[PDB]
Design an enzyme around this catalytic site. Structure first.
Site, mmCIF file in Angstrom:
data_model
loop_
_atom_site.group_PDB
_atom_site.id
_atom_site.type_symbol
_atom_site.label_atom_id
_atom_site.label_comp_id
_atom_site.label_asym_id
_atom_site.label_seq_id
_atom_site.Cartn_x
_atom_site.Cartn_y
_atom_site.Cartn_z
ATOM 1 N N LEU A 85 1.043 -1.081 0.513
ATOM 2 C CA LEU A 85 -0.061 -0.279 -0.073
ATOM 3 C C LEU A 85 1.113 1.438 -0.295
ATOM 4 O O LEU A 85 1.661 1.342 -0.125
ATOM 5 C CB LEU A 85 -0.724 0.168 1.031
ATOM 6 C CG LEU A 85 -1.835 -0.613 1.745
ATOM 7 C CD1 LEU A 85 -2.391 -0.776 2.747
ATOM 8 C CD2 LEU A 85 -2.720 -2.128 -0.201
ATOM 9 N N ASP A 86 0.047 1.898 0.185
ATOM 10 C CA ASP A 86 1.328 3.090 -0.833
ATOM 11 C C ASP A 86 0.883 4.006 1.029
ATOM 12 O O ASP A 86 -0.210 3.892 1.619
ATOM 13 C CB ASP A 86 0.956 4.309 -1.666
ATOM 14 C CG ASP A 86 0.917 3.970 -3.361
ATOM 15 O OD1 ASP A 86 1.819 3.792 -3.614
ATOM 16 O OD2 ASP A 86 -0.235 2.785 -3.841
#
Ligand SMILES: CCCCCCCCCCCCCCCCCC(=O)OC[C@H](COP(=O)([O-])OCC[N+](C)(C)C)OC(=O)CCCCCCCCCCCCCCCCC
Ligand SMILES: CCCCCCCCCCCCCCCCCC(=O)OC[C@H](COP(=O)([O-])OCC[N+](C)(C)C)OC(=O)CCCCCCCCCCCCCCCCC
Ligand SMILES: CCCCCCCCCCCCCCCCCC(=O)OC[C@H](COP(=O)(O)OCCN)OC(=O)CCCCCCCCCCCCCCCCC
Ligand SMILES: CCCCCCCCCCCCCCCCCC(=O)OC[C@H](COP(=O)(O)OCCN)OC(=O)CCCCCCCCCCCCCCCCC
Ligand SMILES: *C(=O)CCCCCCCCCCCCC
Lengths: 70, 459, 65, 50, 171, 177, 55, 122, 128, 62, 155, 79, 110, 87
Positions: free
Chosen positions: N41-42
């Site tokens: 995930l960012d």
């Protein structure tokens, strides 16, 4: 269930002062109120009347309440 | 008046022959007995004053001040016995002796029929207070405070002595009962102008007037608690009593010679209340509030109307009681935290709730909440000044707004908010401090039921 | 007993509160309908308004000159 | 407080009210004005001649 | 009881109650309950207290002050005669203040009692109040907190000089 | 700006804080859930369009113009949580947060109502006064010469001893006393 | 008023975004009366209290 | 409120001022005009303690309504007939006032037309 | 574009609109590190005096004593009479006094002149 | 002792207040000033017994 | 405490300026005293004149209500810039625009109130008529005189 | 004490306005990953709430019926 | 005004208490059927405040407007009185819309 | 009012919210699964996750504590510390 201790400052001394203040006020407040009631009921207040001829009143005979006259 | 003088001087062998641990008990007990005895002065008549002798008399103006003094002495004995705990016994007896001597001079001052005897007692009151301030004060600048206080009073009061002796030589008597019937108009000249200045400047300094008030936030601050109580509660009212007694000889020159001091004292209370808004010291804030209220009394005396005189004497008594209570509360905070800074100890309502209630009551009486006698005096002075001129209502309304502002600022800063984290020596309130607060509060609240005994000689 | 809280769902209802709410709404609407059936004048108008342009000049006393 | 509450007619206020009642009744009965504009009789006052 | 001549009051005229409707008014029932439960025990208690008061009877008198010479017949700087004159003047000042209080109480009572028609029915009380206020203002106003009999004598002398000059210039 | 453990705010931290503030204010303008979801996806697309930019001056100018854009289009009064600062119930219970040192001034008559609690308090105080010298000795040798550089405290390295400066952050009052 | 605010709420329910106007900021921020007065009058009074009277 | 526009946006020579009205004699155009009749005695309104702004030319209906209100306690909805009669006579008095205003307006218009004709010849 | 936020005395510039916030130069990083070091050293001193189990009193703050001494007991030693101080003192000290004196004198002169001609309504005035 | 609130908080203060008003407030003059009752035509006075005459005939319009 | 920790006079040389900056616990570059015009400030630092509301509320302050740290230099007007008093936080609208908008609104409302006072509304009715000489005796006129008869006719 | 949460498979965005937001974003080319989180407010007892006019007209049926009954009763009572 | 204003405040306090001290109308909605009694009372109070016929507000507010219209009055004061009446209607139905109608916006646990 | 909280309920609710996220496969996440590494995930995904948990529990997590909440166990421990549970 789930009772938590509540931290609060010491309220003992404040309650002790309030109890002492109430007791020492009432210690003479109750007899004075009882005495004032008994003065008012049984002795009673004076009645306004004209001065009889040739008679001079004392300086305390110009007031109505018994306590003020005393 | 010898039935009050003699027990007061008999307090001296009582404190000098007591045990090492029973001096406070004996002195407090017997001073409270004499304070109870002082109620016999209330035999006042609608036409004549209560004239005891050639030297002493007491009308309806001096009687509330006398009762206030004789009631205030045991309060100072109860207040001043915690910070003198570790003191030497001889120094403790000397402190109590100075308090007794000050009370003796004060009760001989208000009853003096002769004006020069009033002057002699009124300047004999300087020595015990100066000694108390400069000896038992806690700070460095108590010596400077004593110098300022002494020299302001003496520089104001020496022309008063000269003018009183001139009045004695010109009129033939300084007896106040004679001068009520032998008085003459004082015409407009330069000689009479300087007569008015000489007769008025001593009491203008002692009250104090705005601009001559520089000694007050020093003497009221570096003094001990008993000294601050007797300075705020009684000693400021010697000036008021003096102007009430001495204005009789200064007519009709007062009606235009009173203009500059009316402008000084009307604008001065705004300045002192604004100073109160931005004070970092609690004791200094109470002292400046005292300056503002005494400016109100100055205006009331100077406009010389019946409503103004009644408001002036009621306001004098009420401010004496309120200022004494406020100084006592500030002293209790000082004993707890050992600092006079107002921002240091905060949020004390969560720790000291009944003391917070006492603080709230003192603040409420400070901003003249009706029907307290504070509001009665302030209201009567406001009515009389409105009769004097109409823009005085603008000035009085501004003063009332700022007075409420700084009183509630005091209360909200000291008692409310989040408590200080690092202060952990906040002990619970003693019975002695609570008893002192209640003995300041209960007469003040009871006097609202019968306010006619504090309304001066022309009620 | 009390009402058990629900997660992510419509909460539990008592029959008493639904009955009370419906009864008081019905009481309000009955009162409005009743007072409009009876009065109908404090909202609509009490007396006719006569237009002054239709008054003849004789009853107003206007002399023709 | 008990002593202050029962003070014997402090500064003659109640006596003044009673005497005012007596004087108002006496002056109202005989048609006299209730109060005059002059406190002292003008007959016993000698104005300065001008 | 008080004296009804110094404090006058018109006779009370109450209308008869006419129950047009058949619904019982609760006020009559509440008055019956008040007389049964409240008025009777209070009356009995006051009767007992008055019986206790009638066993011993003592009287108090109204103080009478004889007239002494006023300040107009006092020599200047003669403290005895001036002292007596000043005391007499102060007593009359107090009595005059309470006379004005009596008239003000009369005016307020008339204004409350007459109801909505007070502007018409309280003309006499307004006239009495105006006259007594004018007399009080001409006698005691503008004297200051140090008022005395000499100040009042000086004020009356100045007013009499003004009146004499006004009647001389209008002659 | 004002950080306990760091002297500055990084570029990525500034971008993330701007993203959270912009999304909260967009939720305030767009009170309904579906409308907020749509415009949140549009804002997320706008933020992801310039994600892969290596020019530092261009990324800085993009951040500055984004902050100007946010300040032009902020809500006059956004939604604040009730306990968040500026909220309606923020610092409401501070009048009930009595510190724990007030229990040492209690009278023995009212101390007898809670025997076991005061026994536990006594053993807690014994532990604190036993561990204080050890924890200050640990802190003395871990601070570099010249004073600490940040405000972070070290943990307890060995077994038996508690972390240094632990008393007033363990015995803090509850959120609802 | 009921019709106008029903239409206002229905337009609020739509999927459109508009920047706020000066009328909206005038109505929402209480007509700028507290933000100006409570920042201006205490500033002047307290500065006059310290810089002029106290010092 | 057309008269508001006729006085402010129009001309003020035709529209009468309300503060000074009427400006014509009551016998102008009204032969053998009679006065209004007062039914309630001055004492009857005086002892019923009516408000001074309430003692208009129809206070007899008000006195009847007040007696009906007092005698019907506690039935507070008992009689609306007396209230309706008082309100109707109030409406009649208001119609009288409107008639007076319209009469003043028409007289002012007639005078303006007369002066316009007088200017047309002289 | 967008209207530029102009700062005022009573409305400061926001920290997100300040152009000096986005500075990355090493002098500003060194300054921020030095400020953090000073703050952390002072916090360490306070917390050492704060968490002592054997302390029961007030952790004295020299900054507060410094502030009160500067607010109270330094003003006259650091006061020099010059043009600015004398001008402000004459403006704020004798200005309002003279203004209020002339206002009250004019009002009382007008009232006293109206009273002596009998032009002022004083019909029910007997309280003063 | 179920209904002591209607006795200790109502009846005893009502007794005390009625005593105080009857024998100490109504004794002094102009203490309770009460507006005189409103009188309509057709009424009958209690004290005098007189009958107030009815008003004039109405000139009916409705 | 000592006399070398208290404030002093205005620093002239950079040496006493550095000593004062160390005294008040701040960097020499960030330490600016008040200008030496004789007002009485001394060497007390001139902090940036911002209220305590602008501080970070999530930081762990030593004094949380005041948002103040122990040992930090205290502003000259800190008792004025508390959260109970004068705020200096940024506003959503520029200060000049709020001032002009509020003043224009108040002035326009006052002008239109004056205009409406000049040209009021009324109804097409004559004056209200009252009997008995416009209620002469009820309005407080004395009865011994006689007023001018106010006569109201029918229409 | 212990509370049991419902199932999470049952929160489907179909039939809700979140599906309309999904197809609008699909037309643009975006997605909302949090659409299934908000899907509870549009299903169950919180679905198909009344309008404003239906909120003001709450209980109008029973009020109108009672009014009709009372008017008929008053009509019969006057005879 | 005392009656319905006090009861409007009481119902707002009930909504505040049921949603964990949340006073924002942006975090409300869907309470028409969740809290029926306070909904009924809020609707009745807003209708009485706006001046629905033959409720409590009708017997005072309409007489005020009727007397304000037919009087010797400031024109502008009457105009802003009427506009303020319309605005009272507007914010009353704004409260009813955002606090009762629609879908829930409050936190998940109920 | 104000029902109490436990670690089991907090963990169940936080895993419920994280399970309703479309970017996380529900059969793979656990109590100690990381966001950047274990889930991919960012940072913006982490910010939106934190905002979702704030909306779920009704209280605000400050950013200076939000940047360090990287696995569900730290979110549980942060909420447990902020709300003072298991007393
Ligand atoms: C606290 C600081 C301020 C203190 C202010 C004190 C008051 C200020 C004014 C005081 C003037 C001096 C006393 C005057 C007494 C007058 C009595 C009298 O009979 O007057 C009529 C007499 C008149 O003279 P006579 O009465 O002998 O003559 C008979 C009368 N005629 C003239 C008609 C023939 O006045 C004087 O003799 C002179 C009065 C003026 C004196 C001027 C010098 C003093 C100047 C002020 C000094 C103030 C204190 C300075 C120091 C302060 C501290 C460092
Ligand atoms: C005096 C000058 C010096 C000042 C400082 C003095 C310090 C030393 C103190 C010495 C002792 C005190 C002296 C002053 C005493 C003053 C009090 C006093 O005696 O008053 C006499 C007054 C005298 O009242 P009176 O004058 O009306 O009585 C008539 C006179 N006799 C008795 C002879 C018929 O006492 C009272 O007023 C008492 C009345 C009854 C008790 C109170 C009943 C009401 C209480 C409140 C009820 C609730 C109200 C609503 C509350 C709502 C919530 C807030
Ligand atoms: C500083 C601290 C704060 C303040 C504390 C108090 C300070 C002030 C106290 C004293 C104030 C001044 C004295 C009172 C003046 C009242 C007005 C007055 O009478 O002024 C005198 C004079 C007025 O002029 P005129 O009426 O013509 O005088 C002839 C009189 N036979 O006036 C004039 O002719 C103008 C002035 C001439 C010089 C006067 C000098 C003597 C008075 C001051 C000493
Ligand atoms: C009182 C009389 C009520 C009935 C007559 C007035 C009706 C009215 O104003 O209707 C306007 C409007 C409803 O109409 P509309 O919005 O077009 O339709 C909604 C979908 N059914 O809106 C409403 O009806 C709601 C507002 C009614 C307010 C009435 C009390 C003031
Ligand atoms: C002439 O217009 C007579 C009426 C009074 C003046 C105008 C009043 C305008 C406002 C009331 C009507 C509003 C209609 C929605």
């Amino acid at each position: 269930g789930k009772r938590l201790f509540i931290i609060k400052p010491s309220g003992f001394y404040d309650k002790r002062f309030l109890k002492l203040l109430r007791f020492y006020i009432l210690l003479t407040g109750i007899p004075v109120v009882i005495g004032i009631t008994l003065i008012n009921v049984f002795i009673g207040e004076a009645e306004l009347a004209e001065i009889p001829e040739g008679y001079v009143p004392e300086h305390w005979e110009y007031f109505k309440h018994p306590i003020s006259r005393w | 008046m010898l039935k009050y003088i003699i027990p007061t001087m008999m307090l001296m062998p009582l404190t000098w022959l007591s045990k090492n641990s029973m001096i406070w008990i004996n002195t407090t007990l017997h001073s409270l007995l004499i304070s109870l005895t002082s109620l016999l002065l209330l035999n006042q008549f609608g036409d004549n004053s209560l004239n005891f002798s050639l030297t002493f008399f007491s009308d309806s103006l001096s009687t509330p001040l006398l009762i206030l003094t004789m009631w205030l002495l045991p309060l100072m004995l109860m207040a001043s016995q915690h910070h003198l705990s570790k003191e030497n016994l001889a120094r403790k007896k000397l402190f109590i002796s100075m308090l007794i001597l000050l009370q003796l001079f004060l009760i001989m001052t208000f009853t003096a029929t002769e004006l020069i005897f009033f002057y002699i007692m009124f300047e004999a009151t300087l020595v015990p207070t100066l000694i108390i301030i400069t000896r038992w004060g806690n700070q460095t600048e108590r010596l400077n405070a004593g110098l300022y206080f002494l020299f302001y009073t003496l520089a104001g009061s020496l022309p008063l002595l000269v003018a009183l002796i001139y009045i004695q030589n010109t009129m033939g008597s300084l007896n106040f009962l004679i001068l009520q019937y032998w008085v003459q108009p004082m015409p407009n000249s330069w000689s009479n102008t300087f007569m008015w200045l000489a007769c008025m400047m001593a009491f203008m300094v002692k009250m104090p007037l705005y601009g001559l008030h520089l000694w007050l936030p020093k003497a009221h601050v570096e003094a001990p608690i008993a000294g601050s109580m007797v300075l705020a509660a009684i000693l400021l009212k010697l000036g008021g009593y003096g102007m009430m007694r001495i204005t009789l000889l200064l007519n009709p020159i007062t009606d235009f010679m009173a203009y500059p001091f009316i402008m000084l004292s009307l604008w001065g209370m705004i300045m002192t209340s604004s100073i109160c808004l931005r004070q970092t010291d609690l004791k200094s804030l109470i002292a400046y509030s005292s300056v503002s209220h005494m400016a109100l009394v100055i205006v009331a005396i100077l406009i010389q109307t019946p409503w103004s005189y009644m408001g002036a004497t009621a306001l004098m008594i009420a401010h004496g009681l309120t200022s004494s209570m406020l100084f006592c509360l500030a002293n209790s905070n000082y004993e707890r935290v050992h600092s006079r800074t107002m921002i240091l100890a905060r949020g004390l309502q969560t720790l000291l709730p009944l003391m917070a209630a006492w603080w709230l009551l003192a603040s409420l009486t400070n901003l003249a909440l009706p029907p307290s006698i504070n509001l009665i005096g302030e209201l009567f002075v406001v009515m009389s000044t409105f009769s004097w001129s109409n823009i005085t209502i603008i000035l009085m309304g501004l003063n009332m707004v700022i007075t409420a502002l700084y009183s509630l600022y005091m209360l909200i800063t000291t008692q409310r908010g989040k408590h200080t984290h690092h202060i952990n020596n906040i002990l619970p309130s003693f019975t002695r401090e609570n008893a002192l607060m209640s003995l300041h509060m209960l007469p003040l609240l009871l006097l609202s039921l019968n306010p006619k005994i504090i309304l001066g000689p022309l009620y | 007993a009390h009402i058990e809280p629900r997660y992510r769902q419509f909460p539990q209802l008592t029959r008493s509160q639904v009955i009370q709410a419906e009864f008081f709404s019905a009481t309000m609407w009955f009162w409005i309908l009743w007072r409009f059936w009876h009065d109908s004048d404090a909202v609509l108008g009490h007396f006719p308004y006569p237009d002054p342009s239709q008054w003849t000049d004789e009853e107003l006393g206007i002399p023709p000159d | 407080s008990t002593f202050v509450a029962y003070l014997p007619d402090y500064r003659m206020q109640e006596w003044a009210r009673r005497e005012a009642e007596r004087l108002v009744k006496y002056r109202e009965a005989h048609g006299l004005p209730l109060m005059e504009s002059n406190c002292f009789d003008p007959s016993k006052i000698q104005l300065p001649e001008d | 009881s008080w004296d009804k001549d110094v404090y006058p009051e018109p006779p009370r005229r109450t209308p008869a109650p006419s129950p047009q409707t058949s619904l019982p008014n609760p006020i009559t029932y509440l008055t019956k309950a008040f007389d049964l439960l409240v008025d009777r025990p209070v009356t009995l208690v006051r009767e007992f207290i008055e019986r206790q008061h009638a066993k011993n009877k003592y009287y108090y008198y109204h103080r009478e002050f004889r007239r002494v010479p006023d300040i107009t017949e006092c020599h200047e700087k003669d403290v005895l005669c001036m002292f007596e004159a000043e005391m007499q003047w102060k007593r009359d000042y107090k009595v005059d203040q309470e006379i004005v209080n009596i008239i003000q109480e009369r005016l307020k009572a008339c204004q409350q009692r007459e109801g909505e028609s007070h502007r018409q029915n309280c003309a006499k009380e307004l006239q009495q109040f105006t006259q007594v206020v004018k007399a009080y203002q001409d006698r005691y106003h503008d004297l200051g907190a140090h008022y005395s009999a000499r100040k009042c004598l000086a004020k009356q002398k100045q007013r009499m000089l003004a009146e004499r000059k006004a009647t001389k210039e209008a002659a | 700006a004002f950080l306990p453990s760091a002297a500055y705010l990084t570029h990525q931290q500034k971008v993330l804080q701007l993203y959270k503030r912009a999304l909260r204010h967009l939720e305030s303008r767009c009170v309904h859930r579906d409308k907020y979801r749509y415009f949140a996806c549009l804002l997320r697309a706008r933020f992801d369009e310039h994600k892969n930019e290596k020019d530092m001056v261009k990324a800085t100018q993009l951040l500055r113009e984004a902050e100007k854009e946010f300040w032009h289009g902020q809500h006059p009064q956004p939604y604040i949580f009730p306990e968040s600062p500026g909220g309606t119930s923020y610092e409401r219970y501070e009048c009930y947060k009595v510190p724990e040192w007030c229990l040492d001034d209690w009278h023995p008559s009212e101390k007898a109502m809670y025997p076991d609690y005061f026994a536990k308090r006594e053993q807690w105080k014994k532990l604190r006064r036993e561990s204080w010298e050890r924890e200050v000795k640990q802190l003395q040798e871990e601070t570099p010469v010249g004073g600490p550089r940040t405000e972070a405290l070290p943990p307890a390295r060995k077994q038996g001893d508690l972390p240094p400066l632990w008393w007033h952050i363990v015995t803090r009052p509850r959120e609802r006393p | 008023g009921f019709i106008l605010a029903l239409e206002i709420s229905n337009t609020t329910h739509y999927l459109k975004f508009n920047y706020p106007s000066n009328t909206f900021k005038f109505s929402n921020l209480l007509g700028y009366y507290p933000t100006i007065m409570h920042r201006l009058t205490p500033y002047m009074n307290l500065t006059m209290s310290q810089k002029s009277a106290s010092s | 409120g057309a008269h508001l526009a006729r006085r402010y946006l129009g001309d003020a020579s035709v529209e009468p001022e309300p503060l000074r009205m009427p400006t014509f004699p009551p016998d102008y155009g009204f032969p053998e005009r009679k006065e209004r009749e007062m039914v309630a005695t001055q004492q009857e309104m005086n002892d019923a303690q009516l408000v001074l702004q309430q003692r208009d030319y129809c206070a007899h209906y008000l006195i009847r309504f007040l007696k009906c209100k007092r005698d019907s306690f506690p039935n507070f909805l008992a009689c609306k007939h007396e209230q309706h009669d008082w309100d109707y006579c109030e409406h009649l008095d208001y119609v009288k006032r409107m008639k007076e205003f319209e009469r003043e307006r028409r007289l002012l218009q007639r005078k303006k037309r007369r002066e316009q004709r007088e200017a047309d010849m002289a | 574009s967008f209207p530029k936020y102009e700062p005022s005395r009573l409305a400061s510039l926001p920290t997100t609109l300040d152009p000096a916030e986005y500075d990355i130069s090493s002098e500003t990083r060194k300054a921020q590190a030095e400020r953090l070091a000073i703050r952390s050293r002072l916090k360490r001193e306070y917390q050492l005096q704060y968490n002592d189990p054997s302390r029961r009193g007030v952790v004295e703050d020299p900054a507060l004593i410094r502030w009160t001494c500067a607010r109270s007991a330094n003003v006259y030693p650091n006061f020099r009479p010059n043009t600015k101080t004398s001008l402000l003192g004459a403006l704020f000290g004798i200005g309002p006094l003279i203004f209020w004196y002339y206002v009250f004198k004019t009002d009382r002169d007008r009232k006293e002149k109206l009273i002596q001609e009998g032009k002022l309504d004083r019909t029910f005035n007997i309280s003063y | 002792r179920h209904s002591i609130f209607a006795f200790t908080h109502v009846l005893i203060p009502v007794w005390i207040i009625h005593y105080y008003l009857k024998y100490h407030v109504t004794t002094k003059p102009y203490t309770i000033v009460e507006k005189k009752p409103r009188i309509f035509p057709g009424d009958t006075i209690l004290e005098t017994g007189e009958v107030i005459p009815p008003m004039k005939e109405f000139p009916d319009q409705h | 405490i000592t006399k070398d920790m208290l404030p002093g006079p205005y620093p002239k040389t950079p040496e006493e300026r550095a000593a004062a900056a160390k005294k008040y616990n701040m960097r020499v570059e960030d330490y600016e005293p008040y200008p030496d015009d004789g007002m009485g400030y001394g060497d007390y630092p001139k902090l940036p004149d911002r209220s305590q509301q602008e501080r970070d509320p999530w930081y762990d302050w030593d004094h949380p209500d005041l948002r103040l740290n122990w040992g930090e230099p205290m502003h000259w007007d800190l008792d004025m810039y508390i959260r109970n008093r004068v705020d200096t936080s940024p506003t959503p609208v520029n200060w000049n625009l709020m001032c002009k908008h509020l003043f224009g609104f108040v002035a326009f409302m006052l002008f239109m109130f004056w205009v409406g006072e000049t040209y009021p509304t009324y109804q097409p009715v004559g004056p209200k008529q009252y009997p008995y000489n416009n209620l002469y005796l009820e309005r407080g006129g004395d009865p011994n005189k006689e007023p001018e008869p106010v006569v109201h006719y029918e229409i | 004490s212990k509370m049991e949460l419902p199932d999470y498979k049952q929160w489907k965005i179909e039939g809700t306005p979140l599906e309309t937001v999904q197809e609008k974003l699909a037309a643009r080319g975006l997605r909302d990953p949090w659409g299934r989180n908000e899907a509870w407010r549009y299903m169950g007892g919180f679905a198909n709430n009344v309008s404003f006019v239906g909120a003001l007209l709450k209980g109008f049926k029973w009020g109108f019926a009672a009014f009709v009954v009372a008017v008929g009763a008053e009509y019969y009572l006057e005879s | 005004h005392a009656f319905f204003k006090a009861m409007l405040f009481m119902c707002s306090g009930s909504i505040i208490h049921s949603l964990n001290d949340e006073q924002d109308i942006r975090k409300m909605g869907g309470l028409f059927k969740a809290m029926p009694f306070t909904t009924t009372a809020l609707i009745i109070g807003s209708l009485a405040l706006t001046g629905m016929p033959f409720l409590t507000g009708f017997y005072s507010k309409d007489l005020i407007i009727e007397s304000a219209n037919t009087s010797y009055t400031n024109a502008w004061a009457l105009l802003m009185t009427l506009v303020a009446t319309s605005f009272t209607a507007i914010y009353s139905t704004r409260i009813i819309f955002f606090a009762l109608l629609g879908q829930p916006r409050f936190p998940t646990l109920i | 009012d104000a029902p109490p909280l436990t670690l089991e309920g907090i963990k169940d609710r936080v895993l419920y919210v994280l399970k309703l996220y479309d970017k996380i496969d529900p059969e793979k996440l656990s109590v100690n699964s990381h966001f950047m590494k274990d889930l991919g995930l960012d940072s913006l995904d982490q910010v939106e996750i934190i905002m979702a948990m704030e909306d779920e529990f009704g209280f605000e997590i400050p950013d200076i504590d939000a940047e360090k909440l990287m696995c569900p166990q730290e979110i549980v421990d942060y909420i447990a510390d902020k709300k003072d549970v298991y007393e």
